[PDB]
Design a protein around this motif. Structure first.
Motif, mmCIF file in Angstrom:
data_model
loop_
_atom_site.group_PDB
_atom_site.id
_atom_site.type_symbol
_atom_site.label_atom_id
_atom_site.label_comp_id
_atom_site.label_asym_id
_atom_site.label_seq_id
_atom_site.Cartn_x
_atom_site.Cartn_y
_atom_site.Cartn_z
ATOM 1 N N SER A 6 1.013 10.727 13.715
ATOM 2 C CA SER A 6 0.801 9.652 14.669
ATOM 3 C C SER A 6 -0.629 9.603 15.183
ATOM 4 O O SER A 6 -1.340 8.619 14.982
ATOM 5 C CB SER A 6 1.754 9.808 15.850
ATOM 6 N N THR A 10 -2.586 6.116 14.891
ATOM 7 C CA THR A 10 -2.834 5.583 16.212
ATOM 8 C C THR A 10 -4.295 5.160 16.208
ATOM 9 O O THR A 10 -4.624 3.989 16.384
ATOM 10 C CB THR A 10 -2.619 6.670 17.270
ATOM 11 N N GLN A 33 1.670 1.999 22.956
ATOM 12 C CA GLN A 33 1.732 3.252 22.206
ATOM 13 C C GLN A 33 0.557 4.142 22.572
ATOM 14 O O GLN A 33 0.723 5.306 22.926
ATOM 15 C CB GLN A 33 1.710 2.970 20.698
ATOM 16 N N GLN A 36 0.536 5.601 26.268
ATOM 17 C CA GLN A 36 1.613 6.586 26.231
ATOM 18 C C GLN A 36 1.066 7.950 25.844
ATOM 19 O O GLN A 36 1.441 8.977 26.411
ATOM 20 C CB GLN A 36 2.686 6.147 25.225
ATOM 21 N N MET A 37 0.165 7.952 24.876
ATOM 22 C CA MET A 37 -0.437 9.183 24.409
ATOM 23 C C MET A 37 -1.245 9.841 25.513
ATOM 24 O O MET A 37 -0.852 10.875 26.053
ATOM 25 C CB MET A 37 -1.338 8.888 23.217
ATOM 26 N N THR A 40 0.746 11.867 28.035
ATOM 27 C CA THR A 40 1.318 13.099 27.531
ATOM 28 C C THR A 40 0.273 14.198 27.361
ATOM 29 O O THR A 40 0.559 15.374 27.582
ATOM 30 C CB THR A 40 2.016 12.843 26.189
ATOM 31 N N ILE A 127 5.484 10.734 20.869
ATOM 32 C CA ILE A 127 4.438 9.919 20.283
ATOM 33 C C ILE A 127 4.716 9.350 18.897
ATOM 34 O O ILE A 127 4.380 8.205 18.612
ATOM 35 C CB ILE A 127 3.143 10.719 20.251
ATOM 36 N N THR C 22 9.475 8.206 19.303
ATOM 37 C CA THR C 22 8.721 6.964 19.412
ATOM 38 C C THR C 22 9.177 6.051 20.540
ATOM 39 O O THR C 22 10.331 6.082 20.962
ATOM 40 C CB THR C 22 8.778 6.160 18.108
#
Lengths: 133, 800, 133
Positions: A6, A10, A33, A36-37, A40, A127, C22
């Motif tokens: 990912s 990404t 997406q 979101q990374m 985390t 992810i 995801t």
């Protein structure tokens, strides 16, 4: 591991679909997406290298999310983004290389590096996406 | 002037501008968009009821299996009516859109079982206690119900309560949880919701006083930009916005203070003015008065104009030359760019002619203009006196340098540092004046004129102050505007009497006023809400329209939605919205995405749409005719009935299509030569227990009808709920025999109930506290006015 | 025919973008397409094989759909999905192979097998999607 994957698609689908002039909505599903990374990540620290001539560099995360200025991006939007991508690129490179040198007879099918072993952790699974490579 | 009226109005009917001025302000301060949105009930669509079941050829087997059924089953007759029905659901869904949720607020005792088992909501509860006792429910059931305890984690705020809903129900409530649209809240965020500017405006003090629990939670304001470019066609509406935005402005613009006594000045004025010296047209230069007001008006008026991106004209008075001089003031500052070309026309030429040119001795050819490109300008190319010459280019420029993208997307056509507080412009506007003192015509002329000019000059030390003032104010206020603002030629003007102007001018002292903290916020707050509403309704709007299309509702779509839309926006009174406007408004709306939220839900409704429709108790989809003695089927729930779970082998005739489009009897012929055929869509319904009936072949009757006149509403078809019981008519199983139904129907069987699969767990956060208004937590004071500063940093208002 | 195509890119972009973790909003546009299929299918019967050493396996359709809720995907979600995919995979394989052997002098450019001839039917066209292969 899949995690790792990912991280890239990404960035690629990023350094690719994010350019001076595309309508926001062509990345709405993407932008998300991404952020979101960052989330985390921020907080946790990493160690890469520590073998042969491979340098031991320390990576730390402290980033602000992504805006959304409407109706096609303005140059300024990009540059403030590209600056954040480049730290991840230079990162992954060091991550890949570090796990691309270690070998193991017993279990040489799993993660070896302190860098990756930490990724297989559950708190990151959030992810994974677009596994078409 | 009566003739002028009727027409000046025929236009005002093409303007959704509310009538009174003030009546508009209220409408705004009133918009209170923000709303905590919570909810109680879990929300479903169907509970499970007991129902009698008769085994094949059987009586009430005595057992009563549980099936799912619809609470509130109100379905129309006809595929079309169905589609519309669901649509209302969409509207209901949105109006009930729970922004967030918590479970403790729904806690309930699971009466049965060890471990102080607590469950989700009332229905969840009921069911348990209910089944617990239906003795024919696997030992595992009681067990599960039993020991299954809630899940309470003090730390982290987790709460996982056991629950029971339904596939389509979990469906809903779920997403409602995964889209709690509620972001955290740190002192830092409050600090940040503040214009990147203000904070750095020394004059203003900032401080924090209250803390923030990790419980803090707010709801995104949502301030997307324009999305709709009304700037290039919907003049009628812009005018209405401008107006609005304008009044809004005046409401803010601080009132002035410490002025020079009206009487005092005007008196030294007469001494200087040499009023009554031959000249016939006296007492037209002194209707200047009421300045203690005029200035306040002229001042306010000027700002809003700008902010609100409005455009205006000038209650001009040719004779009164003074009134003109001051005009030059006006252009020296206010970017002519926003001044209907014309009012500038009069003004300048009046200056140009009855001034400069002759008193300066230059073109004694006074000036002949038809309609080039900027008469005020051109004067330049041919003027021999630099001072004069710079004014010209600067004035004909100062184009309101329309280029800015600050604090994140705020195109607020800016203005020269120069002007700002470099001011000099003024100093130069004066210096140029300082050498306009000479020949051509009668004496009482130069004397009177120049003397007036001087009053601008001396005062100039102060006139400076004016520049600074506005400079700041506009440059300040502005900061807190979310709505973008493209410069547009409004359809309406705004009268600005050089009267007041002139007053403000020579009549301002070492005063110093600025926007009260509290004042500023209030301003932000408003535009905010408004925005939020605009954006929001937009979404609400779009969502519907798009649905309106796949939901084949080829009917309302036009006006219908638009009307409600505008109304909720408050600002304007529809009606007077030209028709090319409302429709054009749709034309633009229909071409946009859809706030994931909105969209994401419709996608859900459509997927289950089908399922609902056949799930109802009244109404099934179409019937079949075969004029072939057919074998009645048998189903545990209805007993002995004539149902068909599948078409296939017989043409399909979209009732909807037929009815809507008139009949050609295609059907009439097929029925007449008696041919196998099917009818599709939603339909009425009839149950019957008359064993006899079947023998009488009633089902092959009802049909003939139609023919008569089109219609087909009156098409109640028939079913034979022939259970081995409730049918007094049972001299049937006593005789060797088999059911000869000439026809049957599509209503698919209701769904059986399977516990396991309906029992879902629940992920809910725990204990918030929702905050609105925000700001408030901000503690802020202000230096004493006598100490201001602009980008300059030297000091705004500095003529001690 | 084109129909056929979709069936796959559906599954690929599926067995690929649907992984434990995801974020949903990456598959929203996808999920849909998927379901749409199941529907059109359910209520249909097929048959492949019958030639040479090719087995004659029979197929039926009757499936539930997929939740739409959930910010992120939980393991459980996947497995209940993968189970449904595997029946389609093992299906298509048999479909391809069955039409990959028959030849026709006449219209050797048209569909052959009882399996595919049925697909070119109009009622199935509602499934086409992403023809970039």
């Amino acid at each position: 591991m899949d995690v790792l994957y990912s991280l890239s698609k990404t960035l690629k689908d990023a350094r690719d679909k994010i350019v001076e002039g595309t309508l926001y909505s062509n990345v709405s599903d993407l932008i998300q997406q991404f952020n979101q990374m960052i989330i985390t990540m921020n907080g946790n620290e990493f160690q890469t290298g520590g073998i042969g001539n491979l340098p031991i560099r320390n990576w730390n995360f402290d980033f602000g999310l992504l805006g959304t200025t409407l109706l096609n991006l303005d140059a300024n939007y990009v540059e403030t983004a590209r600056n954040t991508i480049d730290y991840f690129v230079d990162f992954v490179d060091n991550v890949c290389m570090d796990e691309m040198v270690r070998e193991s007879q017993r279990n040489g099918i799993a993660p070896q590096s302190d860098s990756l072993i930490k990724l297989s952790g559950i708190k990151f699974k959030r992810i994974n996406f677009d596994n078409s490579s | 002037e009566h003739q002028k009226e009727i027409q000046y109005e025929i236009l005002q009917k093409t303007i959704p501008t509310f009538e009174p001025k003030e009546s508009i302000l209220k409408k705004l301060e009133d918009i209170k968009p923000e709303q905590a949105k919570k909810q109680t009930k879990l929300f479903r669509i169907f509970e499970p009821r007991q129902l009698p079941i008769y085994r094949a050829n059987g009586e009430k087997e005595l057992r009563n299996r549980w099936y799912w059924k619809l609470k509130k089953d109100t379905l129309p007759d006809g595929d079309y009516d169905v589609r519309e029905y669901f649509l209302n659901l969409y509207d209901q869904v949105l109006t009930e859109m729970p922004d967030y949720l918590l479970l403790k607020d729904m806690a309930v005792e699971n009466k049965n079982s060890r471990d102080a088992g607590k469950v989700v909501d009332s229905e969840t509860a009921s069911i348990c206690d209910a089944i617990f006792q239906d003795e024919e429910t696997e030992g595992a059931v009681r067990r599960f119900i039993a020991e299954m305890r809630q899940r309470v984690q003090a730390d982290r705020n987790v709460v996982n309560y056991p629950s029971i809903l339904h596939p389509i129900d979990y469906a809903f409530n779920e997403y409602f949880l995964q889209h709690q649209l509620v972001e955290p809240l740190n002192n830092d965020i409050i600090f940040n919701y503040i214009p990147e500017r203000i904070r750095n405006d020394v004059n203003y003090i900032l401080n924090m006083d209250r803390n923030l629990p990790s419980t803090a939670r707010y709801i995104r304001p949502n301030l997307l930009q324009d999305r709709l470019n009304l700037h290039d066609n919907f003049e009628s509406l812009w005018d209405t916005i401008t107006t609005s935005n304008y009044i809004l402005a005046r409401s803010v613009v601080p009132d002035l203070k410490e002025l020079v006594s009206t009487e005092a000045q005007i008196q030294k004025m007469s001494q200087d003015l040499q009023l009554e010296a031959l000249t016939i047209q006296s007492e037209t230069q002194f209707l200047t008065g009421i300045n203690s007001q005029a200035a306040n008006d002229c001042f306010k008026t000027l700002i809003a104009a700008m902010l609100s991106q409005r455009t205006m004209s000038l209650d001009f008075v040719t004779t009164n030359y003074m009134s003109l001089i001051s005009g030059m003031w006006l252009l020296t500052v206010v970017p002519n760019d926003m001044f209907i070309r014309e009012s500038l026309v009069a003004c300048q030429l009046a200056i140009v002619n009855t001034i400069i040119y002759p008193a300066f001795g230059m073109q004694r050819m006074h000036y002949r203009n038809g309609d080039p490109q900027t008469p005020f300008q051109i004067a330049e190319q041919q003027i021999q006196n630099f001072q004069v010459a710079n004014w010209l280019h600067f004035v004909n420029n100062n184009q309101f340098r329309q280029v800015v993208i600050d604090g994140v997307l705020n195109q607020v056509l800016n203005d020269n540092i120069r002007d700002g507080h470099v001011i000099n412009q003024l100093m130069e506007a004066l210096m140029q004046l300082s050498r306009q003192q000479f020949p051509t015509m009668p004496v009482d002329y130069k004397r009177s004129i120049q003397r007036g000019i001087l009053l601008l000059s001396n005062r100039l030390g102060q006139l400076v102050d004016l520049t600074r003032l506005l400079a700041y104010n506009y440059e300040t206020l502005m900061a807190c505007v979310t709505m973008n603002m493209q410069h547009v030629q409004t359809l309406t003007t705004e009268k600005l009497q050089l009267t007041s102007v002139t007053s403000l001018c020579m009549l301002i002292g070492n005063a110093t006023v600025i926007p009260s903290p509290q004042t500023l916020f209030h301003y932000y707050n408003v535009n905010v809400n408004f925005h939020s509403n605009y954006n929001e309704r937009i979404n609400d709007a779009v969502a519907i329209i798009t649905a309106a299309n796949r939901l084949n509702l080829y009917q309302k779509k036009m006006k219908a939605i638009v009307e409600d839309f505008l109304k909720r926006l408050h600002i304007f009174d529809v009606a007077r919205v030209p028709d090319d406007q409302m429709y054009r408004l749709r034309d633009r709306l229909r071409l946009l995405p859809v706030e994931v939220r909105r969209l994401d839900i419709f996608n859900l409704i459509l997927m289950n749409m089908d399922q609902i429709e056949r799930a109802s108790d009244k109404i099934a989809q179409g019937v079949i005719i075969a004029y072939r003695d057919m074998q009645l089927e048998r189903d545990e729930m209805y007993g002995y009935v004539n149902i068909a779970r599948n078409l296939d082998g017989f043409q399909q005739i979209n009732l909807e299509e037929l009815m809507r489009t008139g009949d050609y009897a295609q059907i009439t012929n097929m029925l007449l030569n008696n041919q196998p055929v099917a009818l599709v869509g939603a339909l009425p319904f009839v149950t019957d227990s008359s064993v006899i009936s079947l023998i009488a072949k009633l089902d092959a009757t009802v049909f003939a009808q139609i023919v008569k006149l089109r219609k087909v509403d009156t098409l109640k078809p028939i079913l034979y709920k022939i259970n081995s019981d409730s049918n007094d008519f049972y001299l049937v199983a006593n005789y060797d025999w088999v059911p000869t139904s000439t026809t049957k129907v599509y209503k698919q069987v209701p769904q059986q109930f399977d516990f396991r699969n309906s029992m879902h767990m629940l992920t809910s956060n725990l204990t918030f506290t929702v905050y609105s208004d925000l700001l408030a937590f901000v503690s802020a004071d202000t230096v004493e006015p006598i100490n201001a500063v602009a980008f300059d940093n030297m000091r705004i208002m500095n003529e001690l």
